[PDB]
Symmetry: C5
Subunit: 268 residues, 5 copies
């Protein structure tokens, strides 16, 4: 009787995880939080490389990094404490004394990362039609609604598939609003800067789109091959956490590095 639990727990409590699956999930989470701490150091040590009016961006990047390290460190431990080896079969099964594994740790902490990540670009690009405050408030409201609806939804990814999908769609609405506003921001920021900055901004747009789209992909991962599909297995757990790590790295570290390069180019 698992109740409103994530599907990792069902897979681990029925079939269990082979050595490769368990060890790979642990390794990918470890790499995630290591990347986050290294990026924190990188952003702190490069603050004076940009003009003062851009250093805020750097700071915010650092801020984000802090949150992520702590989460992906906790989450990491969580994984290894939720599943233990059974010598009789050679697989890792759910160990209830280490609690049920839950991805929600990431959702609430996005309440830090999503606003901040949306906010810092407004310290590097210059708006030509929109108001700074209006864009900021839209970003924050839509991100909060998206995160909260998705966080409520993921609790029912096995118990109540209907609620899962409904909350996912209600979240995707705010996601589309965020995407529209961000495209507006980047198009307005391209105006009046050298072609190098425009190239950096187009790269930022592409990276933003892909890496941010990766997250609902991980949301739906156990069902992307339908019920009782190839992805509703330990392969799906591996894929979920791998996509999470890729999207984390891209949307945080690489995004901050491209913002820093843009700030360097715009600096005098």
């Amino acid at each position: 009787e698992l109740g409103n639990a994530n599907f990792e727990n069902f897979i681990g409590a029925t079939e269990g995880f082979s050595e490769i699956a368990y060890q790979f999930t642990s390794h990918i989470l470890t790499l995630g939080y290591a990347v986050m701490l290294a990026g924190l150091l990188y952003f702190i040590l490069t603050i004076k490389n940009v003009d003062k009016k851009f250093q805020m961006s750097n700071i915010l990047s650092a801020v984000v990094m802090v949150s992520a390290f702590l989460l992906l460190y906790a989450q990491a431990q969580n994984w290894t404490s939720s599943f233990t080896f059974n010598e009789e079969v050679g697989r890792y099964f759910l160990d209830p004394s280490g609690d049920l594994f839950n991805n929600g740790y990431r959702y609430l902490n996005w309440l830090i990362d999503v606003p901040m990540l949306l906010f810092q670009i407004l310290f590097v690009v210059s708006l030509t039609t929109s108001k700074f405050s209006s864009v900021r408030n839209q970003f924050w409201f839509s991100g909060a609604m998206m995160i909260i609806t998705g966080y409520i939804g993921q609790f029912y990814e096995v118990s109540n598939l209907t609620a899962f999908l409904v909350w996912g769609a209600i979240s995707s609405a705010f996601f589309f609003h965020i995407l529209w506003v961000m495209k507006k921001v980047i198009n307005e920021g391209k105006e009046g800067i050298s072609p190098a900055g425009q190239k950096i901004l187009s790269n930022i747009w592409i990276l933003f789109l892909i890496s941010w789209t990766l997250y609902p992909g991980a949301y739906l991962m156990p069902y992307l091959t339908g019920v009782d599909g190839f992805l509703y297995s330990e392969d799906g757990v591996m894929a979920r956490q791998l996509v999470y790590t890729i999207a984390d790295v891209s949307s945080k570290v690489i995004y901050g590095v491209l913002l820093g390069n843009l700030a360097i180019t715009l600096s005098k």
Copy 2:
């Protein structure tokens, strides 16, 4: 089973147990709390040289608070996960005494750091007119100490003795109202003789102070706000209490320090 003078979370977890949603949400919200606290430390450290020297003390005090907050919430997070263990037969988290009983007093005593410093730092940005700096500081510190100590005594009896619970709560509320009075005086005097932007910032600071500080007696009273054997005397009440604690912590510490720093910038 005999629990003695323990918080109502322990009683709920020993009788009904917690569902996956309740337990996981409480853990996530405490994790988010301490993550927010360490990211603000960096923020407040990294933005020290953004204000005139005379205001920088505020920043320092903010950082101090952050440290305290982080540590406490980190500890508190761990304590939660160690006090409740999954029971597979029914699929619910029950009290685990080998991990010690859960107690909110960890917050209360640590407020002995937070409450004075928070009340102290505003006196490094605004300039008093008819009030005396040392008088305001001593009143703040004495009233805060009394409030914290009386509430800390009272919360131990939230289940074992409702009468002492309420009596200590009222005794604490007296000092709380005194603090609100002195703070209103301080804000009104600080408004005198400053720019309109600083006046708007001070108004926002007063509103934030009022709401976020009132949230704490709300969390104190949470299990009984729907009466004896009411709806909030459940795992829903535990979730609500920790959520209110986290919202109040973030608002009264991080956002309060950020608004104070904005005020310091406009005055520079």
Copy 3:
């Protein structure tokens, strides 16, 4: 149930056990202690550039002390929670030998850092007149070392051998009085030739030093301050001992360093 040369906390916890209030309060007070120490470390680092170069050593030494203090009070906190475990049948925390016996001598040996450095740092702010710097330093260090070592030997027999307890305590008290004499000389010489404000600060420093340092033999004698089988030979005595330890730690380290820094500012 033979405990040997163990502290009286272990005897109380092995015979009567601790109630929820007693155990939780001891844990909270130790947690507050180490939080205060880390916050003080941050404060003393951040306020280094507030005084002239010649005084900055004081800050550094303060920070040094903080480090030591933090680590021990963090360790000691852990030790408390690991040494006593909840018994559900009666609802009380009893001695848990798998977590090791509780011992307060961790503090003693760590005073081998604190006592010299604290006594040393005042010699970087005040200017001696008739006394020799190196003589004062050597007297401070030797007397402090002897005091700490003799008290550390004595505290192991606070239950198993009252005679050794009291004899070693008196041997320590001799060196304590020597330290008090030398400190009075140092403060009186430092008052000479400075402004009245610095003299008032020095008087406050002397009062604080006296009270806060006298608090330590008080915690040493705590279980017997009401006689054998007295009121304090209970969990109440355990609470009182750890509370006195925390008050003395905060006063003699953090507030002492803050007053020294204020003096350094007035002398700058």
Copy 4:
């Protein structure tokens, strides 16, 4: 008992067990590794202002690597101590499955930080002549990623499937040789137009790079370097593997960064 696609440390520890020397030495060497990494982090941060601004990026990248290394090695240290428990009846440490199986893959994925950055940072000290900066960088990054991923896949089968082990190892060795080729090109171009002292430093850097990076496939092959049922298919092989890992880590990260910093110093004005 069934272990599946697990490293050979688990098989040795589950069948023969480890003596006190083997277990204690492995723990000590991993501890020394992560201690060295943290000390190097401190060093590279503290010596940033010792070189001209244009070279300071190198320092930063070193520090970045250090962080990764420290964290990873720290975890791995814990993992060792969690996988093997003393049995008083025989006097040997045996596999403890409640602590998870021991796996070297923690290193491999973390090389996804180490290998690019290490290859990247030298491009902030030396000046290329005929090669394009971005071309060299992209080649380094792609070849390193492929090498790491293929070796990481291969090492899971070092006991359960020797054929896949060797095939993935060879596929990885291809990209390793490409990396060596590009690095030799970089060193030859960097020697041009700098003082003889900097050229000597570059020669030492090339020798160190070659040896220290070649040490890693050696640790990959360690249990079989004396054949099946050989001398190295024992606790001696486990000790040798972790010792080679630690020596290669120190040499290829800390000493590499120190030599790069000395080169940057001689090039500074």
Copy 5:
């Protein structure tokens, strides 16, 4: 309970066990050690700008040793408390194998950081006259490595094979005497051409070096300094060994760095 090539602390704790005073004191002394190391790290970082630039390297290298030391002592502290558990029936702490056996080798390998760096940093303050910098450095590093490695091999047999114990100890003592010789030469050359105050500081540094470094073979021999089945082959010997280790660590690292910094200040303009 067969323990094999294990340190004598495990034998004492497995046969007689430790009393409350002995166990608590060993734990306190290790805790004090790592606390001292972290505080010294803070001190050496915060006092960097107190000396001329050319001397600041000393400061840096001191903090590197403080990092290493800190980590090791922290680990060792944990290890002690994890290896011995209270038995309520008799009131003594006995060996607990689930926490691993206690081993001092953690220190030894970490000396591979401490011993070279400590010997290196003095060469950033004093100026040699007749000796060559690189020759002194190479001699220091080689002799220190050999000393550490031979003693590390030997200490595993302090109970199981006293003969190998003593043979490895003597082989190590040879390199120790070589180090003392080179250090005496270095101090004599550094005294030349500096003010009398710096010469007095150098004399004090030499005395400190001699005593604090000689303390380590003392801890090596501690259980047998009173003969076979002597007084020191007891829990008293365990306390004495760890206390000597802590005193030697503090003296040879923190106080050594402080005296070096004082010398650097007196040499500073």
